[PDB]
C-alpha cells in the first residue's frame, strides 16, 4: 500500500494511472485543475505551478501526467520539472514522469534520438522537443529520485488492454513484429509495476505492447 499523487489526473493518461493504482489498493490523491473525473480518493484542486512542498509531503511517489493544453504552453513541461525538483529534491519521494517516445535513442551508440531523424514528422516535433528538453533537464537533477517513463511510438488512449507489455530501457525497442505501440491501459500497468517493483532510479525506462 502506497500513497501516490497524480498530477493532471483528469487527463487521459492521468486517470488511466489513477484507475490502475486504485485497483492495486493504493491511496491516490488527484491533483487537478477542474472537477475530478478520475476514481481518485482525495482531490487537490490547484494550479500545478502553485504547488508547495506541503502539498507534496506525505507521498511515497508523485506521478506527473502533465500535458500541455496549448502549443505555446509546451515550454511548461520544462518549468514543471524545475518546480517539482524544487519541491521534492532532498526528500526520498519518487518522482515519475509520463514522457514521450521521441527522445529514445536509435541504437547503442546513443548519439542520435528518434526526434532527430530526417523522417520524424514536423507536427510531432513541438511536443517531442518539449518532452526531450524535459528529460534532459531531469538528468541534471542529482538529488532527485526521478524516473522518466517513455511510452511506445504509437500511444493509444482507448487501446485494448492486453495485459502483456515489454519493459525496455534507454534505447528504442520493438516487439517481435517490429512494431512499437501500447495502450494507455497497458502503459499504466507497466508504470505502476515500476512503482511497486521499481528498480530504476534517476534513469529512463520505456514501455510497449507484447
Per CB under 8 A, does 11 bind its own copies? yes
- C-alpha distances in Å from residue 164, one per residue of 22, 138, 167, 183: 20, 29, 10, 11
Residue from 1, 25, 35, 54 binding Cl ion (CB under 5 A): 35
Per CB under 8 A, does 1 bind its own copies? no
Grid cell, residue 114, equals 528518434
Footprint of its own copies on 138-157 (CB under 8 A): 151, 153-157
Residue with smaller CB distance to Cl ion, 67 or 169? 169
Per CB under 5 A, does 70 bind Cl ion? no
Per CB under 8 A, does 47 bind its own copies? no
Rounded to whole angstroms, how far apart are CA atoms 201 and 184? 22
Residue in the structure block whose three cell numbers are 507521498: 59
Residue 147 beta carbon to Cl ion: minimum distance, rounded to whole angstroms: 14
Contact predicate 17/6, CB 8 Å:
yes
Rounded to whole angstroms, how far apart are CA atoms 161 and 158? 8
Rounded to whole angstroms, how far apart are CA atoms 198 and 84? 20
Binding site for its own copies (CB under 8 A): 11-13, 67, 69-72, 75, 106-107, 109, 111-112, 114, 116-127, 129, 151, 153-160, 168, 172-181, 183
Amino acid at each position: 500500500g502506497m500513497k501516490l499523487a497524480v498530477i493532471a489526473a483528469n487527463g487521459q493518461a492521468g486517470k488511466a494511472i489513477v484507475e490502475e493504482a486504485v485497483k492495486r489498493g493504493h491511496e491516490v490523491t488527484a491533483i487537478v485543475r477542474s472537477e475530478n473525473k478520475s476514481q481518485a480518493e482525495s482531490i487537490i484542486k490547484k494550479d500545478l505551478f502553485e504547488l508547495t512542498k506541503d502539498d507534496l509531503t506525505g507521498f511515497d511517489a508523485v506521478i506527473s501526467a502533465f500535458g500541455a493544453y496549448t502549443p505555446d504552453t509546451l515550454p511548461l513541461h520544462s518549468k514543471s520539472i524545475e518546480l517539482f525538483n524544487q519541491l521534492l529534491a532532498g526528500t526520498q519521494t519518487r518522482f515519475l514522469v509520463v514522457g514521450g517516445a521521441g527522445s529514445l535513442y536509435i541504437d547503442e551508440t546513443k548519439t542520435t534520438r528518434l526526434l532527430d531523424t530526417p523522417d520524424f514528422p514536423e507536427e510531432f516535433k513541438p511536443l517531442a522537443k518539449a518532452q526531450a528538453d524535459e528529460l534532459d533537464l531531469l538528468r541534471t537533477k542529482n538529488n532527485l529520485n526521478w524516473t522518466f517513463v517513455s511510452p511506445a511510438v504509437d500511444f493509444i488512449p482507448d487501446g485494448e488492454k492486453t495485459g502483456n507489455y515489454i519493459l525496455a530501457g534507454e534505447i528504442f525497442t520493438t516487439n517481435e513484429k517490429g512494431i512499437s505501440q501500447i495502450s494507455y491501459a497497458d502503459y499504466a500497468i507497466g508504470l505502476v509495476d515500476e512503482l511497486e517493483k521499481g528498480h530504476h532510479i534517476k534513469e529512463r525506462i520505456s514501455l510497449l505492447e507484447k
